[PDB]
Design a binder for this molecule. Structure first.
Ligand SMILES: Nc1ncnc2c1ncn2[C@@H]1O[C@H](COP(=O)(O)OP(=O)(O)OP(=O)(O)O)[C@@H](O)[C@H]1O
Ligand SMILES: Nc1ncnc2c1ncn2[C@@H]1O[C@H](COP(=O)(O)OP(=O)(O)OP(=O)(O)O)[C@@H](O)[C@H]1O
Ligand SMILES: [Mg+2]
Ligand SMILES: [Mg+2]
Lengths: 147, 53, 242, 241, 249, 231, 147, 245, 211
């Protein structure tokens, strides 16, 4: 906090008010506030000490190959797939790929199918569409002289 | 007096830029010639380094 | 594929069994026509079209700035199908910071809302967002995020084909003696963008104020291409895209 | 303050100075696509010629370095001629001291070492060019070796260069997956020129006229460049495909 | 010209030599490589890596023969290895193959390449090499021996070790699986097993370059009938041969 | 700003600044005026003492038996280049038995000053010479700029208040070219030229140093009471 | 697709080819492939109007093929080839193909021939889902009747 | 981003550009107009040589120097720096003449200078040249014409130009090549070099100028580089007056 | 404007070509607004004046004020930046809104390094107060706003430091360079200041110009 602007002073008041009454919410039949943040280096540690927020859940952006194949598999069961397509060709390509990017990738493959005028998602579509929404080369791009 | 502060030569650096120092310096410059005649105002600069200017 | 189709027929997306896309991010080097592309599609599609500079919704006042933004989608839903168009979302879609000042931390309060407004538990029916940006690199990672915005259209610099088309769009309109110099000019005019082309027509036209000709010479076209080229290169080159 | 201003290491273990060369390569906007035929190697490249006043015969990015080794240059044209001169020279020297014409493999490693030394000086600027050396060897057959400003190189089944080369890499990779044979096959070199030109017309989404192409083919015991007159006879040959 | 005759490795103020520290960062960016010393061989191992599949791996090399009795394998920068392999072959001929007529012992050659290291941690206009090498070999009086030559210019004799991005996890696996009798065939099963946990990309006999410094093969000697000399002890394993031992996991 | 430290660093104005700086050494320098006709060249220099006890510093260096140069910059810098000109004038007499052309001698001079200004750890030479001589195409007056640049003029000046001298030469331009054979008159026309570059310092028999070269007169330096007829 | 040259003229050029149609018929007897070439060389013109005009002729040869009892195979392969190249437009062809299906009905061929022929026709419209979809169900009910 | 990147030249800037050498194109921008018309039988150089004072000696200064007997070299920008680049190619050409006893080809000579300017950009210790040259001549392989940028870039040319009036020149040379895209005469091209120096004198119409013209032509000069002087030079002058009227 | 002192074009001594280039982009589309409509081309959206300091870019604008007799909105770029959140942006939109009304218009901006540049992305700080007020400037130059009755005259003595989005022909169409006086032009300058104080005719102006 800068702690001289009104914008900041008003959030100071909120932050103490939530925290105080979180202790008030103790010994109730209620399970206390669930809250999420895509960031985590920006939070005050006064929330993060025991007796307020207790359980800290980790979510990775890494997945192992058995756990990856499952995400592609549930989304693809909801859509239609050619008997000429497979999902085990899709997961070897990346070593790192978070669960939502899999969702969008699956979208792309089915969007591409409208262009081609296809009911099914043939693997051809699927492969081309896979490479779209990957990107992120800046250390393997032209920078293989670090291996 | 002493415009080693508020006198840094303008450069681009990608950290934040020299924006706070030069904001003040550029206000000054425009009122030392106007876009209209300035009144009777004599201005004395005094510096230790005419090289940060 | 994203804007016309699920408005007309979401029955197409239903065949495959897949969700319709919403959220388009357009990004490009400047003068590639990214603002132009949206202006053109707003008069065609024939739904309600909210036009929104991203930098006129931020007030002084404390979270009024967020109050406007929530309303903007709540209006949209109620006029559905509707389109929310945001220009230059570097302004309030900036990087995370949280080591800034009070001014920048304000930006976090408006951004955090707009992120939840797009996807939460609240779903959007046929509300579609086209955001335009001059760099996807200095936008927030949470915004940029796959699934937050769906289709990621690159707007490239006009290809060897494209150059000819653009030159013809601005030259049909003018008075001229008859210009057959585009065969030379497209060749000369490499490393340009759409805005500089549109300027070459204006520039050729200013040589004819001097000649007192009421027609633009094809000779005047050769000069224009050069006049634009030199100044452009010198004063600063243009952005590269990831 | 001085770690990204000579080729010394940074707190990261990276050499940014070496890295800026790789960001200079793609500022010329010249594309290249190179495939190994059955008994030839064909490389096709753009030849942008901006102004009317350039004499087009002189504009080139195919350099003859030997009878068997051509060298195709992407990156600025000053750095191109200095890498090209050093190459011809080393080719002569090899012939001189070892008594056979230089094999490509060896020229690839030779220009690589000179690249390596240029990033371990402090008074030498690494040449910012990606050179692709195309050949037909009598021991290792048609090859492609691509060197780069750092001093790494690897052989290639095909390779592309330029700023739109991400696109070109995609077409060629699909092609060699589907077929399942590492090199393109077709006996006559003329028709590998045809297949190669189609793949550049598909990838870049642009057609090419005779002055926009400049094509080099290394066949057996000779490297030639096709005259722009002869390149049209190939452009017509795509009209019956 | 040259006016760069001042060292760019300089003492840092709280101690340490800053360039050599930095260069060791650049070692741990690169591929993962390991070596296991048996009682009758040394095995060395590395993973190939390309820009795209369009690169060939057939013409690529990352394990090189310095002398027929002494091989090397690196983890760190590709460019620096490439020149330093060639300088290693050069000093090995010029300073023991013209003077004592034969290939140098493993202790001696290691000591020479550490001095090549040393004269780019010092002198002007130069920074440190950005590799760390295992230089494994066999000499007639110190047995099989595995070394690690580093950006500092030190050497350490080892019995099994690993270098590269998966170094931390690799050596703990190797500490617990080491034993004071291994055969060379038993050594291989350790090295492959470990290198499989550091790969997450594709695994094949074409993408793992594996080398043994076993025992003598007269089929690579090139000739027969001088029994005084005994063929390459160094023998790089072909893709077909490696693949069987992969199934053997 | 930071562009001024060395001789290698351009410069956003198209310049290099250090050569620009060395050109200001000529300006703080004393005046010498050259004028030529079609038959005799004249250098008219104003010598400069420090104090009353002091001597006056030689401003005209006879370079050869038909060449003389005059400094208007650094005295140490003038000594280096003068040797170099003598050397190449003597190398021409020895090898080709040829009086070194005046037009050629500006090109030899040229390149000695360029090669230290392109180089690191060198500097430009901050001295401008006016070089007279009489060769095979007649009288010549060269102005050597510390920029390296050589130009051939009918009359020039360099120094301080020098502009006032160019003007005297600029008026009297169509007169002096036409008087030939009469060295008395050229000399006087050059004394009056350098007198409009005064500002309370005057001219005397220890300030004025004249040297001429003619068709019919080899290189002569007049000083003392031999510049007492020609005030 | 569309072009600014073969609108009116080329429609009149297909009317010239129709006066040359009996020469084509007489040529079809000696080798069917020789007759077939002229109608395919006409279908290399981009324009919707001229596309519809040209293909009538191709369907008119496809009665000749269907009439003969060893030439019925050829038309199946051709229509495979028509989907695969690009046709010349994707509006034109989908209608013309139905006329082929129509002909299958009224030809009264050997039962052996009819079975194979309807399988070859359906294989083409397997991944597709536009106009084609409707047609496909129309020939499959008829194929299912034979079985 | 980091501060530096303009104090040397074997730095690259973070965008892969130079500095000094990009700064060096602005040194060349202050220079005198200089054009080259490639005719079928040779080259015609012409250069605006300013009379900057009334105290200069007319027709006794030149900026067109011959290298060997058949390659004219003509430069603009830093004039002393420019003589040094010509001087290097007189040593290089002379070495070629001894070793192989033929006059150095225009493509061979282009190659020899080119390296030289490029070599000064590879060190932090030598200042990159701030001149652009137009050079060509007639050799056994025909006529060729080259412009060599300060960047150590050169290309073939049918007309090239440099200096301040490069804007008007480049535009006026497109017209001459659209009058005669099938070639033009070397006698004729003297007169056109005159006309395109006087139209390009309009960025620089403050002052007065001497036109210097030279040609190397196969059919009037026998493929040797000589100066355009006497009556022919005065015809071209009278030509230019009547055009600008 | 309240009428800024007339300098005419006898106190913009020398630099003819710049006055010519400037009046074409700013003064003709006002007066001769009919002739470009006929030619079917569009008028500029602006001119930029850049060069070394002291070359009278500010002088030429002051002149231009007196000559066109339309509303001239004087602007200094650090005045626009404001410490209350996006009230710097309120200043952009209002000033330009104002220019629609009082049309035809000229906005003269002095400086442009206080709307700085767009290059910041580093976690530690940034200043995204400067960026926002700049990105608002661009949205007024865009097609949905007026631009055919609002000319923007921009003057700066750094041009390198600027972000490419202010630049490009079509935001600021003209890229006018100011050089320093020529030999003859220096003479012209000196003689136009000297009318204000006493002189004698010994003074030869030529000598002074040479110096
Ligand atoms: N793609 C294009 N085809 C045709 N005209 C174009 C194109 N791009 C730009 N132009 C022309 O140039 C004008 C100016 O471009 P415009 O201002 O729309 O660019 P932008 O890329 O959206 O800008 P900014 O980066 O400032 O947001 C257009 O109004 C149009 O006349
Ligand atoms: N060409 C000129 N003719 C007449 N007077 C001039 C000329 N150039 C400049 N001046 C005078 O010099 C004074 C100071 O220059 P001014 O501040 O106008 O320059 P600028 O280059 O627009 O500067 P900055 O970018 O530093 O604000 C002017 O007010 C004017 O009186
Ligand atoms: Mg100012
Ligand atoms: Mg916009």
């Amino acid at each position: 906090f800068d702690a001289q602007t009104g914008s900041d002073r008003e959030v100071q008041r909120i932050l103490i008010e939530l925290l105080t009454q979180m202790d008030g919410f103790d010994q109730s039949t209620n399970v206390k506030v669930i809250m999420a943040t895509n960031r985590a280096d920006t939070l005050d540690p006064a929330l993060l000490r025991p007796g307020r927020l207790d359980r800290k859940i980790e979510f990775p952006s890494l997945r192992d190959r058995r756990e990856r194949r499952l995400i592609f598999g549930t989304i693809a069961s909801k859509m239609s797939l050619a008997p000429e397509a497979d999902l085990d060709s899709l997961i070897i390509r990346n070593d790192s790929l978070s669960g939502a990017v899999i969702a969008a990738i699956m979208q792309e493959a089915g969007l591409r199918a409208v262009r081609k005028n296809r009911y099914v998602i043939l693997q051809s579509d699927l492969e081309e569409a896979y490479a779209t929404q990957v990107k992120t080369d800046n250390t393997v791009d032209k920078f293989d002289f670090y291996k | 007096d002493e415009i080693d502060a508020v006198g840094g030569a303008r450069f681009d650096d990608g950290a934040g830029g020299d924006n706070e120092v030069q904001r003040t310096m550029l206000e000054l410059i425009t009122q030392l010639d106007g876009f209209d005649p300035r009144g009777n105002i004599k201005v004395m600069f005094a510096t230790n380094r005419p090289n940060t200017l | 594929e994203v804007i016309e189709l699920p408005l007309k027929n979401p029955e197409i997306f239903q065949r495959v069994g897949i969700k319709p896309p919403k959220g388009v991010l357009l990004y490009g080097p400047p003068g590639t026509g990214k603002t132009l592309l949206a202006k053109a599609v707003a008069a065609t599609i024939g739904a309600n079209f909210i036009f929104s500079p991203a930098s006129g919704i931020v007030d002084k006042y404390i979270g009024e700035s967020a109050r406007i933004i929530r309303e903007m989608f709540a209006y949209a839903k109620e006029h559905e199908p509707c389109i929310i168009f945001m220009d230059e979302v570097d302004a309030i879609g900036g990087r995370r910071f949280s080591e800034g000042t009070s001014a920048d931390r304000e930006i976090q309060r408006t951004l955090m809302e707009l992120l939840t407004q797009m996807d939460g538990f609240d779903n959007l029916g046929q509300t579609k967002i086209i955001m335009a940006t001059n760099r996807p690199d200095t936008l927030d990672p949470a915004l940029l995020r796959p699934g937050r915005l769906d289709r990621k259209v690159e707007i490239p610099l006009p290809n060897e084909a494209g150059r000819l088309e653009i030159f013809k769009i601005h030259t049909a309109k003018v008075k001229k003696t008859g210009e057959f110099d585009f065969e030379a000019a497209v060749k000369m005019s490499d490393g340009f963008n759409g805005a500089d082309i549109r300027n070459c027509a204006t520039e050729a036209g200013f040589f004819a104020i001097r000649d007192d000709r009421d027609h633009i010479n094809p000779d005047d076209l050769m000069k224009a291409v050069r006049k634009v080229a030199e100044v452009k290169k010198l004063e600063g080159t243009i952005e590269y895209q990831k | 303050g001085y770690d990204r201003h000579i080729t010394i290491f940074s707190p990261e273990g990276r050499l940014y100075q070496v890295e800026y060369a790789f960001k200079a390569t793609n500022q010329t906007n010249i594309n290249s696509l190179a495939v190994r035929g059955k008994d030839c190697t064909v490389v096709i490249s753009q030849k942008k010629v901006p102004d009317k006043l350039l004499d087009p015969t002189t504009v080139s990015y195919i350099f003859c370095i030997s009878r068997t080794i051509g060298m195709v240059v992407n990156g600025p044209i000053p750095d191109a001629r200095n890498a090209a001169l050093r190459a011809k020279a080393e080719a002569a020297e090899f012939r001189y001291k070892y008594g056979y014409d230089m094999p490509c493999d060896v020229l690839a490693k030779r220009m690589a070492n000179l690249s390596q030394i240029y990033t371990q000086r402090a008074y030498m600027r690494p040449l910012g060019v990606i050179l692709t050396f195309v050949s037909v060897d009598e021991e290792l057959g048609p090859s492609i070796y691509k060197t780069d400003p750092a001093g790494y190189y690897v052989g290639y089944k095909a390779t592309a260069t330029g700023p739109k080369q991400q696109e070109i890499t995609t077409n060629l990779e699909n092609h060699f997956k589907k077929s399942k044979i590492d090199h393109i096959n077709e006996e006559s070199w003329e028709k590998v020129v045809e297949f190669a030109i189609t793949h550049m017309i598909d990838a870049l989404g642009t057609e090419f006229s005779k002055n926009d192409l400049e094509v080099g083919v290394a066949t057996k015991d000779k490297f030639f460049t096709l005259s722009a007159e002869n390149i049209e006879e190939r452009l017509v040959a795509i009209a019956e495909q | 010209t040259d006016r760069y005759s001042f060292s760019l490795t300089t003492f840092s103020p709280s101690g340490k030599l800053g360039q050599i520290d930095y260069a060791l960062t650049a070692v741990k960016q690169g591929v993962t490589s390991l070596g296991i010393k048996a009682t009758n061989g040394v095995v060395i191992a590395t993973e190939k890596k390309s820009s795209s599949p369009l690169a060939m791996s057939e013409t690529l090399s990352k394990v090189s023969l310095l002398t027929p009795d002494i091989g090397a394998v690196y983890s760190g920068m590709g460019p620096d290895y490439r020149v330093l392999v060639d300088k290693s072959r050069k000093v090995a001929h010029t300073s023991y193959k013209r003077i004592y007529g034969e290939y140098p012992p493993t202790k001696l050659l290691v000591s020479e390449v550490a001095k090549i290291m040393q004269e780019a941690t010092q002198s002007g206009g130069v920074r440190p090499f950005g590799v760390s090498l295992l230089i494994a070999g066999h000499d007639e009086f110190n047995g099989f021996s595995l070394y690690q030559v580093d950006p500092s210019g030190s050497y350490f004799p080892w019995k099994a070790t690993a270098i590269g991005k998966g170094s931390v996890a690799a050596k703990t696996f190797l500490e617990k699986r080491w034993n004071d009798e291994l055969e060379l065939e038993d050594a291989i099963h350790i090295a492959l097993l470990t290198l499989k946990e550091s790969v997450e990309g594709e695994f094949n006999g074409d993408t793992i370059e594996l080398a043994i410094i076993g025992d003598e093969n007269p089929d690579l000697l090139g000739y027969t009938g001088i029994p005084t000399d005994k063929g390459p002890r160094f023998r790089k394993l072909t893709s077909q041969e490696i693949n069987d031992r992969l199934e053997a996991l | 700003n930071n562009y001024d430290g060395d001789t290698v660093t351009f410069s956003p104005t198209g310049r290099l600044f250090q050569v620009e700086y060395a050109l200001e050494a000529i300006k703080q320098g004393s005046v010498t005026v050259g004028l030529r006709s079609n038959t005799h060249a004249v250098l008219v220099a104003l010598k400069r003492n420090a104090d009353e006890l002091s001597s006056y510093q030689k401003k005209i260096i006879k370079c050869d038996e038909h060449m003389g140069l005059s400094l208007a910059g650094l005295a140490p810098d003038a000594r280096v280049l003068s040797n170099y000109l003598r050397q190449q004038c003597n190398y021409s007499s020895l090898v080709f038995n040829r009086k070194l052309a005046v037009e050629r001698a500006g090109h030899l001079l040229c390149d000695k000053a360029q090669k230290n200004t392109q180089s690191y750890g060198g500097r430009p030479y901050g001295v401008g010479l006016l070089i007279i001589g009489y060769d095979k195409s007649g009288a010549h007056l060269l102005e050597f700029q510390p920029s390296g640049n050589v130009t051939e003029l009918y009359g020039t000046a360099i120094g301080a208040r020098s502009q006032g001298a160019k003007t005297y030469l600029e008026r009297t331009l169509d007169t002096f070219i036409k008087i030939d054979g009469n060295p008395d008159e050229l000399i006087k026309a050059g004394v009056e030229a350098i007198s409009q570059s005064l500002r309370d310092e005057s001219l005397t028999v220890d300030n004025l140093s004249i040297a001429i070269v003619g068709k019919d007169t080899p290189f002569t330096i007049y000083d003392g009471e031999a510049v007492a007829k020609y005030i | 697709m569309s072009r600014d040259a073969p609108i009116k003229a080329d429609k009149d050029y297909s009317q010239i080819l129709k006066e040359e149609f009996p020469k084509i018929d007489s040529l079809a007897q000696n080798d069917c492939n020789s007759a077939l070439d002229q109608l395919l060389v006409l279908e290399k013109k981009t324009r919707q109007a001229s596309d519809l005009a040209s293909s009538k002729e191709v369907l008119a040869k496809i009665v000749d093929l269907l009439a003969s009892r060893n030439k019925w195979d050829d038309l199946n392969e051709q229509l495979t080839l028509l989907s695969k190249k690009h046709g010349q437009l994707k509006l034109s062809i989908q209608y013309m193909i139905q006329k082929v299906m129509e002909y299958l009905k009224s030809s009264k061929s050997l039962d052996l021939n009819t079975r194979i022929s309807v399988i070859e026709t359906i294989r083409v419209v397997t991944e597709n889902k536009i106009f084609v979809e409707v047609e496909r169900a129309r020939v499959t009910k008829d194929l299912v009747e034979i079985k | 981003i980091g501060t530096g990147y303009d104090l040397s030249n074997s730095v690259f800037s973070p965008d892969g550009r130079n500095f000094q050498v990009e700064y060096a194109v602005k040194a060349v921008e202050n220079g005198t107009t200089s054009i080259g018309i490639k005719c079928n039988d040779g080259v015609v150089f012409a250069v605006e040589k300013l009379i900057t004072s009334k105290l200069l000696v007319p027709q006794k200064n030149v900026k067109i120097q011959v290298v060997d007997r058949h390659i004219g070299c003509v430069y603009s920008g830093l004039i002393p720096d420019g003589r040094h680049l010509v001087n290097r190619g007189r040593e290089e050409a002379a070495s070629f003449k001894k070793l192989y006893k033929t006059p150095i080809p225009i493509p061979a000579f282009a190659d020899r200078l080119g390296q030289y300017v490029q070599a000064h950009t590879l060190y932090n210790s030598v200042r990159p040249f701030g001149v652009s040259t137009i050079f060509g001549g007639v050799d056994k392989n025909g006529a060729h014409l080259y412009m060599l940028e300060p960047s150590g870039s050169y290309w073939g040319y049918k007309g090239a130009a440099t200096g301040k009036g490069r804007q008007s020149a480049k535009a006026e040379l497109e017209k001459l090549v659209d009058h005669h895209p099938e070639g033009l005469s070397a006698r004729e091209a003297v007169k056109q070099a005159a006309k395109i120096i006087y139209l390009a004198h309009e960025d620089n119409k403050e002052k007065d100028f001497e036109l210097e013209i030279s040609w190397c032509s196969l059919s009037e000069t026998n493929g040797l580089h000589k100066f355009v002087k006497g009556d022919l030079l005065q015809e071209a002058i009278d030509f230019a007056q009547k055009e600008i009227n | 404007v309240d009428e800024k002192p007339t300098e005419t074009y006898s106190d913009v001594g020398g630099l003819d070509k710049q006055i010519e280039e400037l009046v074409e982009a700013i003064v003709l589309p006002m007066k001769r607004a009919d002739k470009f409509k006929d030619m079917g081309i569009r008028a500029p959206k602006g001119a930029l004046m850049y060069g070394p300091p002291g070359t009278g870019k500010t002088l030429l604008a002051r002149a231009c004020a007196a000559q066109t007799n339309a509303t001239f909105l004087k602007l200094a770029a650090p005045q626009l930046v404001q410490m209350y959140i996006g009230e710097g942006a309120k200043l952009v939109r209002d000033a330009f809104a104002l220019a629609k009304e009082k049309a035809p218009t000229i906005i003269f901006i002095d400086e442009l390094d206080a709307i700085g540049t767009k290059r910041f992305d580093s976690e530690k700080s940034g200043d995204r107060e400067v960026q926002r007020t700049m990105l608002e400037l661009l949205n007024q130059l865009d097609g949905f706003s007026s631009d055919d009755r609002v000319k923007v005259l921009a003057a700066t003595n750094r041009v390198d430091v600027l972000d490419p989005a202010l630049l490009r022909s079509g935001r600021l169409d003209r890229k006018i360079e100011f050089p320093l006086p020529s030999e003859d032009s220096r003479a012209q300058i000196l003689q136009i200041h000297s009318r204000k104080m006493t002189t004698d005719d010994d003074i030869n102006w030529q000598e002074l110009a040479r110096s």
